[model samples]
Target chain A: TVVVTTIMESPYVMYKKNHEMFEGNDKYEGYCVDLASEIAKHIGIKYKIAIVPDGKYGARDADTKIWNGMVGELVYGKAEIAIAPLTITLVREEVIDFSKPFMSLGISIMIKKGTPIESAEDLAKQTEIAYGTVDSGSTKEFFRRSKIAVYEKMWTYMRSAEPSVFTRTTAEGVARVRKSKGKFAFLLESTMNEYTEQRKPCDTMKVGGNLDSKGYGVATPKGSSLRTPVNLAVLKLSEAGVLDKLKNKWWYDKGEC
Target chain B: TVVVTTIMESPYVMYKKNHEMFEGNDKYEGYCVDLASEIAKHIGIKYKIAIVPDGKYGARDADTKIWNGMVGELVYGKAEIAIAPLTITLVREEVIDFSKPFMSLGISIMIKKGTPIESAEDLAKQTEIAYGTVDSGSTKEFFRRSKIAVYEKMWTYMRSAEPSVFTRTTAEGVARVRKSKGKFAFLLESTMNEYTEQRKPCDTMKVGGNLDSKGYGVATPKGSSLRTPVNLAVLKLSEAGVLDKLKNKWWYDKGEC
Candidate 1:
């Protein structure tokens, strides 16, 4: 049986109500869960979905010089595949393979309702507002690695901000944006930002186009035998309009925005 | 004196009310006009704003092998700079230089109010709902050059569409969307789509995120002395929030949508 490692990211992978009663893969319901099942059906493969041992999305720890999270699972052959909102980046591609992106996303700014902030430039020029990104994710890494002057300046501000602006989770970062009134902005993927904008309370909005363009892909260990089948499955789903259908089902079908 | 050429695109560069009474560049006002003035001020340069004689926003004719519109003016030394919502595309960049993008944009679909369409894939799936893009702009070019299977299929449908689906101008495309009674969708830049959505009559809305990511930049003739100053000025304005301010001034200050 193929072992697929996933994550707990909402909409992508989440526990169904009373999932404790369900056995094995039946315990969860979400975009990635459904997608994994679909890919398995298409490729005629038997598979079991399991969560990454670590909750993190996967990052290379600078100090430890080690890979962690789902990426680590695939890197060490603990799983044959990965299916989540796993971002495709240059660093990850070095050690693993990713299918054609199942979804496109980018870093975006989330601001409270009526916040005067319009762009990162606005936040950079003033001291009244505070902003931070979800720790250990691609969004934070984007700022940390940027060479552009505006982004470099922003990195300096975020790196030195008082009271430590970074949040350990997207929910925590979003909660800070809501609770801080108009004083805080949260930087996360456009997918999350758009989803939150449609959620109840609707006191926040995604204020600008994304800062960078990238996509989330299905991942596998380098040269894994499943890569070709998974890529073809994604391409077929994309051409058949299933990907858009899934996105609409999860993001906008019940949108209140 | 630097001859800055531009196009008379709505909300970008447009004739001022009672412009006949004003002389020289004062007769024009809009986002690009204000942006040009700001850049000139920041760079301490004397520049004259003149509309492109062809009224087209630069596209190379495939058969005749000629570049026309604002890009032609710059390439042929008829103008020193182009400041408008002119998109920065690979073809244009090869012949001219562009400042760091002052504005980000993407191809978006414009549907009349109450249309059933929700995504480009929706339009691609059916024959009853017709869709088209501006005849010579980047939106059309995006579909023509896309290697993605979904977009390639879209190009096939658009290429062979009956009754000449392409519109000569954005206004014509917008007008077709309004008059088609939900039968037609107009694809154009998100900047233009959003601006039109905010105008009077308010009968249209931009649906979904853009098809691709791109931006508009200040153009200069290749290897021109003005390129460095213009690029730096744009960077300064972007960092200071002037670009965002100019966008708000043109897009939302009098919004009726």
Candidate 2:
């Protein structure tokens, strides 16, 4: 059995806002929480989750590798697994192991309603239209390295800009886009973009498509014994209709979870 | 240093016929191979790659999660990393960790050169004109789950159709679209669609815009100690001009890398 660690991420693995009192530590309260429980139940293993910070916490360094990050915890043998809104890429796979994906997603370019940027080409073609992504994040990197039209050209815009358009999170970028009215385009995950689209004024709309295929996964150590069981458990939960129920609950029914 | 593992993939990660032969026991190579080496150099890490099967492999019991086909090896822990054209998505991320994206991409509809189908609304407004995605892949799922105007309406056609309308791969779907003249629309990655558009006969072209934002990522196990280093490596490669060079080498360079 592996120690299940997660974050307070909304829609992916967060608590119902109003019932936060009861959900902070409950096993069946959030999307990932319930999903993890079902995986454990299917595999006949006991799993426990402690609220952990997101992946950024894992990026910090320490003289002894025993830092406060989830990655640090796994290396130090403090926790065995992490199931949150993490992305999969060639770089991370070098150290940890990943399982068959249970979900797939991508970062999107969101523009305020009526913005002229309809595709990567459009953004690349226009000099007046400014764009940016979350700083130190995948969305920003995707565009920075894109080969297609606008993204290819965007690197120059981002690197040479006096103010430096990148932000630390989607929230900041989205805000900048909205404030820019028709001048700025924010790149982020479709999940966040879609959610913002439904919000007030709903002026935000996604342009082009995701820069990459990104999704959430369970994190485990390089050679952790828990990997197989957890992977099998994910399949089991999917088949039992448990994974679907959890996604539906989190994506629509729960709002916060 | 984090151990890097990968499989030689085609177009995305395979050896070109013209390249000088790489050393012993090598079964595969390509742009991704060049990129992988560049990344290792950027991060100053030692790396290795092995050949793994792609979609041509076979079927699996999604129920039991026993994989007999495709690149599910990363999840099974036989490999520590997937540096090829791996996509980042929700279902996949639920079990893996990815670095900042190396590429940006999306799934979109490909029309037969001059087909009249232009937008989601155009597809939905007409009943005789039909559309489909590769069977059981991301495009099909997008139509199945999306709330977009035309895609939401197009689900009925996708869900209930003769011959299943769905195909086995992007090439197959594009071929189907080519054969159907203007009756069928093939849904696939924008790059593939664009690639097809320039190929012989020049009978196909990407239509309207992408249905979803999707991209390629380096998938890894969660809580991997390598995320930060790999991310830094990607940044270094991008900054040092290694990644953009690979992008040109692969997509735009005509396999000259």
Candidate 3:
């Protein structure tokens, strides 16, 4: 059986109401849940879902060069597959293999309405507004590695700011944006922001164009034999519109406001 | 040699400024050439470049169930791979496999800067300015298949209008925009429109926001043995920042406007 590691992201993965009554896979439900079910049926594989112990999507440490989150699960052989909203990025792809992306999302900025920001440049040019990304995630890494002058400046400021601009999770960063009286913004995935845009009261909106483009792929360790069938399964489902349908089902259908 | 099919689009693939000064792969210069070269080096495959005979990106005909454009080369076994800016779509994905997008783009509206259109809604709500997409292009097909009210209405107006808003090529559509005196709007891929934004005089700009989001992938015939390695090469190059660098080298490096 494959140990499928995932993060507890809403719409993608969430514990159902009254979770104490359920066990194992039955304990969770969401679009990623359905995605896992489809992949299993398509490839005839048995698997069990497990959340990353660190509760992260995944990132690696510079000091030890070791990894954490879903990535750690795959790299250390704790999981056979990571069927989560893991951004298929450069650093991660080198240590593991990814199926062709099953979904598309780009890095974007999320801000409350009347925030007086429209572009990344606007956010970068001002200090009255504080912005941050989920720590140990792709967006923060993008900022740190970006050589573009504006982005580099933005990173320099974030890294040396008086207060830490990094949050341990997207949920916390978003919470910061929501209650900071327009003083904070969350830089996150486009789909991730849009999911929150549907939250009650509709107080936040994604500002600027996507900062950059990339997507999420099912991750497997390097040399894993599972990629071939997994790649085929993703293509099969993508062609059938199951992926888009799933997006609508979770991102829009389940949405309010 | 692998029959690597491609299209002749500027910045992606284009004739070198001089012909007598060039030959073979040297005969052309653009992002696609660099991409094709990088792909071969990473995967260690020898390939010959061939232009798509029909000069279309690949769209299928309903009556005959035949495809035209770069897609035709693959389905008919005329080409082993199409390393072009081909949009990955449901219909195309069924007949051919594609690598995870090397680039992300979405349907966008390009108009002369003063145009009143701010969104797809603006186009669908008025008749002062006309909007349409290239015939036999994914943009047109997107409208035709879209159940979204705004896009469906746009398609309805375009497919049946007496003047026929569909152009035979993206160039023709872009030409239509430049000469239409703000009377015509060409809806095409985001990258396609952005390339034109760099054209001298800089009259056209993509506005509102992307209508829909998806991307361009390296296409291959279904069941081909090439996908796994091709997939790896794409990720490797993407991670190395070569793709991003290539874009800068071709797009902004040459931009005069």
Q: Which one wins by lDDT: 1 or 2?
A: 1
lDDT of each residue in A90-137, candidate 3, tens digit only: 667778878767788778999998899998899888899998888867
Residue-wise C-alpha lDDT for candidate 1, range A130-201, written one tens digit per residue: 888987777777788776677778888898998988998888998999999799998889998988898888
Off by over 4 Å in 3: A1-5, A21-82, A90-102, A107-168, A172-211, A219-257, B60-67, B222-226
DockQ of each: 0.04, 0.09, 0.22
After TM-score superposition, the amount by which residue B99's alpha carbon in candidate 3 deviates from its true location, in angstroms, is 1.3
TM-scores, all models, native as reference: 0.59, 0.56, 0.76
**Model 3: per-residue lDDT, tens digit, B105-167?**
778999998988888999999888998998877788778877778888999898888798999
Most TM-score-accurate candidate? 3
How many angstroms is the interface RMSD of candidate 3? 4.1
- Using lDDT as the yardstick, the better of models 2 and 3 is 3
State candidate 1's DockQ.
Answer: 0.04
**lDDT: worst 10-residue window of model 1 chain A:** A235-244
